[PDB]
Amino acid sequence: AKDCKRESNTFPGICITKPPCRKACIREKFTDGHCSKILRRCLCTKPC
Amino acid sequence: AKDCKRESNTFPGICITKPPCRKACIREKFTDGHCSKILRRCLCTKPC
Amino acid sequence: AKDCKRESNTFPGICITKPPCRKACIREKFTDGHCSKILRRCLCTKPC
Amino acid sequence: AKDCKRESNTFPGICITKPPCRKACIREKFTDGHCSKILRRCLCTKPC
Amino acid sequence: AKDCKRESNTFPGICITKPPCRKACIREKFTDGHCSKILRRCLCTKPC
Amino acid sequence: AKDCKRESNTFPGICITKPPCRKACIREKFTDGHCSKILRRCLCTKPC
Amino acid sequence: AKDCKRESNTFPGICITKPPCRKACIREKFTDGHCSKILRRCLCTKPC
Amino acid sequence: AKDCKRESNTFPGICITKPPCRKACIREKFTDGHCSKILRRCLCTKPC
Amino acid sequence: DCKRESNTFPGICITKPPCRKACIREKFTDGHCSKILRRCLCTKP
Amino acid sequence: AKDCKRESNTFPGICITKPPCRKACIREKFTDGHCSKILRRCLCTKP
Amino acid sequence: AKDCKRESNTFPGICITKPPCRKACIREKFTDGHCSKILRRCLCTKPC
Amino acid sequence: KDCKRESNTFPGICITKPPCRKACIREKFTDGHCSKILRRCLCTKPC
Amino acid sequence: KDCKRESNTFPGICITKPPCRKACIREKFTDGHCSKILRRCLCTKPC
Amino acid sequence: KDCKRESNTFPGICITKPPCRKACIREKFTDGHCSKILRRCLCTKPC
Amino acid sequence: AKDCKRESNTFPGICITKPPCRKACIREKFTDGHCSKILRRCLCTKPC
Amino acid sequence: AKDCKRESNTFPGICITKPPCRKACIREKFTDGHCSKILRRCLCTKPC
Amino acid sequence: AKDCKRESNTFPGICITKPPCRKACIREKFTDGHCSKILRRCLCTKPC
Amino acid sequence: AKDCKRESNTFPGICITKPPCRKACIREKFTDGHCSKILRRCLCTKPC
Amino acid sequence: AKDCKRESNTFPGICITKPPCRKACIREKFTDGHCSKILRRCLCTKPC
Amino acid sequence: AKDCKRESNTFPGICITKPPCRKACIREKFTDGHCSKILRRCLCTKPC
Amino acid sequence: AKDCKRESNTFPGICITKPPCRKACIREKFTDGHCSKILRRCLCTKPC
Amino acid sequence: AKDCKRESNTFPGICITKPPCRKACIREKFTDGHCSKILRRCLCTKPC
Amino acid sequence: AKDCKRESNTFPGICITKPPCRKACIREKFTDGHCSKILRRCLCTKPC
Amino acid sequence: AKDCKRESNTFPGICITKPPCRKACIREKFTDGHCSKILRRCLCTKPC
Numbered sequence A, B, C, D, E, F, G, H, K, O, P, Q, R, S, T, U, V, W, X: 001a002k003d004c005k006r007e008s009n010t011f012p013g014i015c016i017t018k019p020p021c022r023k024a025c026i027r028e029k030f031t032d033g034h035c036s037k038i039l040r041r042c043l044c045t046k047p048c
Numbered sequence I: 001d002c003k004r005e006s007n008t009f010p011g012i013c014i015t016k017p018p019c020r021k022a023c024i025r026e027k028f029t030d031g032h033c034s035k036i037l038r039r040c041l042c043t044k045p
Numbered sequence J: 001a002k003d004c005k006r007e008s009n010t011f012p013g014i015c016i017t018k019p020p021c022r023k024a025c026i027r028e029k030f031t032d033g034h035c036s037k038i039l040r041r042c043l044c045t046k047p
Numbered sequence L, M, N: 001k002d003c004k005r006e007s008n009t010f011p012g013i014c015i016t017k018p019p020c021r022k023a024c025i026r027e028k029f030t031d032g033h034c035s036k037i038l039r040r041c042l043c044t045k046p047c
């Protein structure tokens, strides 16, 4: 069972590396964040 | 804009109608559930 | 669930990053904006 | 002036004709509803 | 509140982005213009 | 070389013949109505 | 050369035979009328 | 409804844009010209 | 040879003799029914 | 109505555009030529 | 946001529904099991 | 095979294996390799 | 409404209703009408 | 075929056969099946 | 409540009327035969 | 060539794989069963 | 529930009726032949 | 010299890779098997 | 086994019927040719 | 020009890189092998 | 095994058939020419 | 190696065919010009 | 006007930040070096 | 004045960066090599 997921509302650029997307997701009260594989979107995750 | 989303862990088959996927997601402590477009998965949603 | 969606009327080009589409949607009396997955269109959103 | 659009949360089955989807959308405080052409979803619309 | 629709009689090329189709429709006494997704036609709209 | 068209909101079933679709469109303040070719929808038309 | 063509505005039924479709076209200020191949529509023709 | 139409006799190739087919129709004593949807033919329209 | 649909034929073309006479009145040499649409198709040189 | 139609005999290729079939069909002593939509046959026509 | 993952060694066929793969993974000392999206493989998951 | 999971601690792009392998051992894994296309640091440990 | 079934005894194309109605009554039905498009003799009787 | 009629008690859209078959049995029919395109619950019984 | 269906192997033409197709199906030890709606095929039926 | 086929009367769900529909058809005194192409129906077959 | 199928090598035109396709298939050492539903191809069949 | 073709009677799942379908077709006394592009069916082949 | 395939090099037009493409492929020392379904290409086949 | 082409009969899974597909095709008496662009199949090539 | 390829600099229109594009590439000192699949471009090829 | 690329400053409309775009780039002191695949822009190239 | 653009020929790895790409482009006789949005390519820019 | 393109025959891995693809292309008697945009293939270029 993976965590929930919602695209970041504060991430401005194109998700290349994981640490930058995690930093923006933590502002949105998420526990982690990673880049989408194809569209390169910053996806925030949290235990649901 | 959306809310937190995750695939259903308890949905048995193909998601075609919404009520069967909604009832499975509410049992998983979610608020709603809808069918994915192509693979017809039962995606559970809840406010983040 | 999701918010109410509509395509932007003032967005100039191709939706590649979020900030250019969010600002164009906010000027259209919306609350947020994001890019369409394939056609890369600026989609304006706001709570129904 | 296109309306804002969102998929119905209450329409159970597959959208084939307009009246059943329009009934579920108007019940959700929307002004109209129509079927998607390929996937046959019930899309609710209301002015915005 | 869905608007009517008629293909533009003045659009000289292929509907690739929205602004040039919106401007060509306003000159035809229409209120909005959008591109058809497949054939890339400029479709004008107005309240009806 | 066409009129402004929009799908009917009151037509109950499948558009097979023209009169039943034309009557529902004139009631909707349109001038004429015809069946769509493939999906068999009642399309209301009126001069732009 | 080939005659100009337009679908009949006043044909009530399904274009099964040519005599009934031809009579309706002449009442619409046309010279002849024939049934379409697939969708069984009453097409009206006149010199051009 | 619609205007009486007939395929152009002088348009040289494939109908891609509207003005090139429109000009070939006005030279054939017509008022407008548009491209057919799938076969991409130059169709000449004029008021009946 | 050349082919054209009949304008004088009143109904569905089931047999050939009814369509053959209707085409001869149209100054054609023969008339036969289409395979599927059951139309009276006149033929002439 | 319609004009008398017959498949062209000189033109042996596949009817892609209208001008090539309209020209070669006339050289068979007809008045017009066009392409069939599906089979792309050069169909001759005359009154 | 994801657990430790490996393809099942005891799942015979192609993963279509979740219950068949989940039962095979638990017998392999795993906590869950889900189908891959494209290749439809039975992937077993357990907390790292 | 082993149990696989993407590294939570690798900072950049997985260019070579040793840097990702060390970062996975600090996450209590036994090995790590680069993803073939996206160049991610995937940690591996025996299940 | 009534229960519907295509006539098994009607010989040809359903052009007018009375010929199809007579054939349906012989099949222990109450009425029969021609279909819109295919012109079939469809029998009707109360379920 | 058997005498068919659309169900007057089936509320939604016919997708699977069991839910429509039960509605037709309550309507004094023997079986029920979905229409192929419109997905309507058709009730069948021996004429 | 249908019977066992199989397409005729002896019908030589297009299934226009039913008596010609029913006769050819009886020679194939089938009890009945009817025309298919769209493709106009001779379909032979018999109790399963 | 083909066998006599009739849609299954006891198949509860939707035909994705052959074994589930084959067992339902053998249960109905048929010899084999397969999934239809589009509507995913379970079709029972047996030698005529 | 079907026989082995391969398209005819010698069928000259469009498969409209069955006997012309069956004749060309039997000469090609097949037992039967029928038309393809849409593309109107002559398909030869023989027991595998 | 194209081989004859028939759908597999024994292949359970959905044809994604060739080895699973080739193995099932070989057990059915066919020489080869492959996946269909769109519907992902297992099709067996052997010399006619 | 399946035959080796290569597109025809001498076929002049658009592949509609099989005999024109088969004759062209045999003129190139292939054994058979067929028309591709969508783009209508003349494809030659020959045992590898 | 282009070589004769046939899908590999022995390639295990998804064609990501070329050398794994080349080695399998050379073993099958072909000269080279490359991956199909979308479906990622191993295609064996050799002079016709 | 594909030849060295470059788009034609002199081909005027949309590549439909091979001879017109092949003739233009021979003028440009190439050995062969074919039409691209989707965009219908004239691509000149020659041995590397 | 690769040349530099800049959009044409003088190309008026939409890049459908290559010859018009290549000629417009030579007037801008470039060596070649070609259309973009999707946006149909006239991209000029010359040795950088 | 717009500056010419070309991918770097000496930048050895994947770009993430701008300064490393600018230094590589200036060595290649360019005036600036920015990195592509998605593919992370070091693109060199200089006035045409 | 563009060059001729051909995919590398000897590039073993995924085309991530350009210098590795250039080396593989120069060994194949090409002048330069770059990575493809979507499929990340090593394309070799040389003057025609």
Ligand SMILES: CCCCCCCC(=O)OC[C@H](COP(=O)(O)O[C@@H]1[C@H](O)[C@H](O)[C@@H](OP(=O)(O)O)[C@H](OP(=O)(O)O)[C@H]1O)OC(=O)CCCCCCC
Pocket (backbone or CB within 6 Å): A005, A035, A036, A037, A038, A039, A040, A041, A043, B007, B038, C037, C038
């Ligand atoms: C040439 C253009 C062609 C269009 C290319 C289509 C462009 C395209 O592929 O991106 C679209 C997007 C995928 O985008 P992307 O890969 O970046 O995002 C992934 C995707 O959302 C998965 O569904 C997620 O897994 P899950 O759901 O949480 O389990 C995954 O989350 P995670 O696992 O990483 O945490 C995400 O990374 O998905 C679609 O909408 C289907 C499009 C339908 C395309 C239908 C094609 C048959």
Ligand SMILES: CCCCCCCC(=O)OC[C@H](COP(=O)(O)O[C@@H]1[C@H](O)[C@H](O)[C@@H](OP(=O)(O)O)[C@H](OP(=O)(O)O)[C@H]1O)OC(=O)CCCCCCC
Pocket (backbone or CB within 6 Å): B037, B038, D005, D034, D035, D036, D037, D038, D039, D040, D041, D043
């Ligand atoms: C590249 C093509 C493939 C892309 C696949 C990408 C799959 C995917 O993500 O859904 C998109 C589409 C849904 O089609 P569908 O007609 O049901 O839904 C329409 C679609 O969402 C349009 O984008 C909407 O317009 P817009 O957004 O407001 O502008 C339109 O709203 P409106 O007109 O009523 O206002 C909707 O009706 O699906 C496919 O194209 C093929 C399905 C594949 C499986 C087919 C199974 C039958």
Ligand SMILES: CCCCCCCC(=O)OC[C@H](COP(=O)(O)O[C@@H]1[C@H](O)[C@H](O)[C@@H](OP(=O)(O)O)[C@H](OP(=O)(O)O)[C@H]1O)OC(=O)CCCCCCC
Pocket (backbone or CB within 6 Å): D037, D038, D039, E007, E038, F035, F036, F037, F038, F039, F040, F041, F043
């Ligand atoms: C091959 C591409 C397929 C993608 C779909 C193609 C993309 C798409 O949007 O489809 C619309 C199509 C239209 O069908 P339909 O004939 O009913 O509607 C016609 C269509 O809107 C034309 O564009 C209209 O002309 P125009 O615009 O005013 O000039 C015409 O009006 P008029 O001329 O009579 O006045 C209308 O009659 O319906 C499907 O095929 C859905 C089948 C889905 C099957 C549902 C189950 C899966």
Ligand SMILES: CCCCCCCC(=O)OC[C@H](COP(=O)(O)O[C@@H]1[C@H](O)[C@H](O)[C@@H](OP(=O)(O)O)[C@H](OP(=O)(O)O)[C@H]1O)OC(=O)CCCCCCC
Pocket (backbone or CB within 6 Å): F037, F038, G005, G035, G036, G037, G038, G039, G040, G041, G043, H037, H038
């Ligand atoms: C791939 C594109 C083709 C399909 C989509 C095409 C959809 C579309 O564009 O509508 C046109 C067609 C109307 O068919 P229909 O036979 O009623 O009308 C004919 C048609 O309009 C021809 O184009 C006319 O010739 P032309 O143009 O004036 O020279 C001809 O005039 P005439 O010369 O006889 O007097 C008319 O008779 O409708 C379908 O094909 C639906 C079949 C699908 C039904 C569903 C089947 C599953």
Ligand SMILES: CCCCCCCC(=O)OC[C@H](COP(=O)(O)O[C@@H]1[C@H](O)[C@H](O)[C@@H](OP(=O)(O)O)[C@H](OP(=O)(O)O)[C@H]1O)OC(=O)CCCCCCC
Pocket (backbone or CB within 6 Å): G007, G038, H035, H036, H037, H038, H039, H040, H041, H043, J037, J038, J039, Q038, Q039, S040
């Ligand atoms: C195989 C099944 C075919 C049966 C279906 C064939 C049915 C058929 O023959 O119609 C032509 C249609 C394409 O015609 P196309 O879309 O270009 O032209 C439209 C068509 O004529 C409509 O009927 C018109 O509406 P209406 O009627 O006046 O109201 C419409 O007028 P308008 O709206 O623009 O003003 C026209 O735009 O189909 C094909 O030929 C595709 C060939 C596929 C390629 C295969 C051949 C290589």
Ligand SMILES: CCCCCCCC(=O)OC[C@H](COP(=O)(O)O[C@@H]1[C@H](O)[C@H](O)[C@@H](OP(=O)(O)O)[C@H](OP(=O)(O)O)[C@H]1O)OC(=O)CCCCCCC
Pocket (backbone or CB within 6 Å): K002, K005, K034, K035, K036, K037, K038, K039, K040, K041, K043, L006, R015, R016, T014, T016, T038, T039, T040, X038, X039, X040
């Ligand atoms: C059916 C048709 C078959 C042909 C379609 C062939 C297209 C194709 O299938 O590719 C996808 C394939 C497997 O995809 P598939 O969706 O089955 O498996 C997913 C994939 O392994 C992800 O990487 C996993 O996420 P993550 O990494 O752990 O975060 C995910 O785990 P989880 O989300 O469940 O936790 C898995 O479900 O993997 C490739 O990249 C091959 C190179 C692609 C081609 C590269 C082109 C350059």
Ligand SMILES: CCCCCCCC(=O)OC[C@H](COP(=O)(O)O[C@@H]1[C@H](O)[C@H](O)[C@@H](OP(=O)(O)O)[C@H](OP(=O)(O)O)[C@H]1O)OC(=O)CCCCCCC
Pocket (backbone or CB within 6 Å): F037, F038, G038, G039, M004, M034, M035, M036, M037, M038, M039, M040, M042, O037, O038
């Ligand atoms: C192939 C493309 C062209 C189609 C031409 C092919 C010819 C064609 O159009 O077939 C029509 C055929 C029968 O139509 P037909 O008019 O003969 O008979 C009517 C039909 O059975 C309706 O379903 C009934 O409605 P309902 O019982 O009251 O609910 C009606 O009952 P009633 O009211 O009289 O008592 C009957 O009269 O219906 C199909 O199978 C759907 C085909 C899909 C149509 C394709 C849509 C594009």
Ligand SMILES: CCCCCCCC(=O)OC[C@H](COP(=O)(O)O[C@@H]1[C@H](O)[C@H](O)[C@@H](OP(=O)(O)O)[C@H](OP(=O)(O)O)[C@H]1O)OC(=O)CCCCCCC
Pocket (backbone or CB within 6 Å): D015, D016, F014, F015, F016, F038, F039, F040, G014, G039, G040, M006, M037, N004, N034, N035, N036, N037, N038, N039, N040, N042
């Ligand atoms: C979802 C997209 C929207 C729908 C788009 C497609 C719209 C469309 O195709 O309509 C089909 C619909 C009936 O289709 P549908 O499959 O739902 O209903 C079947 C139909 O009534 C047959 O006639 C019945 O057989 P029969 O008669 O007893 O022998 C059959 O009974 P059974 O075998 O199950 O027991 C029924 O299941 O009604 C029309 O025919 C209108 C003519 C349409 C063409 C009009 C041309 C003028």
Ligand SMILES: CCCCCCCC(=O)OC[C@H](COP(=O)(O)O[C@@H]1[C@H](O)[C@H](O)[C@@H](OP(=O)(O)O)[C@H](OP(=O)(O)O)[C@H]1O)OC(=O)CCCCCCC
Pocket (backbone or CB within 6 Å): O005, O035, O036, O037, O038, O039, O040, O041, O043, P007, P038, Q037, Q038
């Ligand atoms: C995805 C779009 C759908 C098209 C897919 C095509 C779907 C397909 O493969 O069937 C062919 C279809 C049916 O033809 P047709 O009406 O002659 O045959 C009927 C059909 O087999 C039904 O399934 C039968 O009911 P059931 O099964 O026993 O319950 C019915 O038996 P019954 O009830 O009378 O006893 C039969 O009458 O005709 C076309 O070609 C559509 C034009 C397609 C050409 C498209 C371009 C013009």
Ligand SMILES: CCCCCCCC(=O)OC[C@H](COP(=O)(O)O[C@@H]1[C@H](O)[C@H](O)[C@@H](OP(=O)(O)O)[C@H](OP(=O)(O)O)[C@H]1O)OC(=O)CCCCCCC
Pocket (backbone or CB within 6 Å): P037, P038, Q038, R005, R035, R036, R037, R038, R039, R040, R041, R043
């Ligand atoms: C538009 C026309 C649709 C008519 C489809 C009518 C129903 C139908 O026939 O489906 C088959 C087709 C392709 O499906 P698919 O690729 O899985 O199967 C192939 C197809 O049957 C070809 O016809 C075969 O070649 P041939 O015949 O031996 O020459 C080929 O065999 P081979 O070459 O490998 O040996 C098969 O692999 O699917 C669709 O077009 C629409 C599905 C999209 C989803 C539908 C949802 C609505």
Ligand SMILES: CCCCCCCC(=O)OC[C@H](COP(=O)(O)O[C@@H]1[C@H](O)[C@H](O)[C@@H](OP(=O)(O)O)[C@H](OP(=O)(O)O)[C@H]1O)OC(=O)CCCCCCC
Pocket (backbone or CB within 6 Å): R037, R038, R039, R040, S007, T005, T034, T035, T036, T037, T038, T039, T040, T041
């Ligand atoms: C969207 C459907 C529209 C109809 C498309 C009908 C389906 C269809 O056309 O398949 C082919 C396509 C591409 O296949 P793919 O790219 O893997 O393989 C290429 C393809 O075979 C080309 O035809 C080859 O060129 P050519 O012939 O030698 O000149 C080329 O050879 P080369 O260049 O490498 O040397 C091959 O690489 O695969 C799909 O999209 C399946 C989507 C369905 C997936 C269903 C998943 C559920």
Ligand SMILES: CCCCCCCC(=O)OC[C@H](COP(=O)(O)O[C@@H]1[C@H](O)[C@H](O)[C@@H](OP(=O)(O)O)[C@H](OP(=O)(O)O)[C@H]1O)OC(=O)CCCCCCC
Pocket (backbone or CB within 6 Å): A038, A039, C037, C038, C039, W035, W036, W037, W038, W039, W040, W041, X037, X038
């Ligand atoms: C669905 C997306 C639509 C397909 C997109 C298909 C588009 C395509 O084929 O290549 C473009 C893109 C490269 O993106 P990338 O950002 O690296 O390169 C940009 C591109 O060159 C633009 O043209 C430049 O803008 P402009 O012209 O000078 O104004 C821009 O330079 P600048 O502005 O910074 O100076 C460059 O950054 O590649 C992919 O999409 C990766 C495929 C992964 C996803 C595959 C898609 C399924």
Ligand SMILES: CCCCCCCC(=O)OC[C@H](COP(=O)(O)O[C@@H]1[C@H](O)[C@H](O)[C@@H](OP(=O)(O)O)[C@H](OP(=O)(O)O)[C@H]1O)OC(=O)CCCCCCC
Pocket (backbone or CB within 6 Å): T037, T038, U038, X005, X035, X036, X037, X038, X039, X040, X041, X043
């Ligand atoms: C229309 C949908 C896509 C059809 C693809 C049909 C075409 C096809 O199969 O390959 C194209 C593309 C690979 O593109 P890729 O980026 O790898 O390679 C580029 C491509 O070959 C261009 O055509 C080249 O330009 P040109 O031609 O020389 O001018 C360009 O040369 P250069 O500029 O670098 O020097 C190359 O870099 O593959 C997909 O889009 C699959 C994405 C997912 C699609 C799968 C959807 C299910």
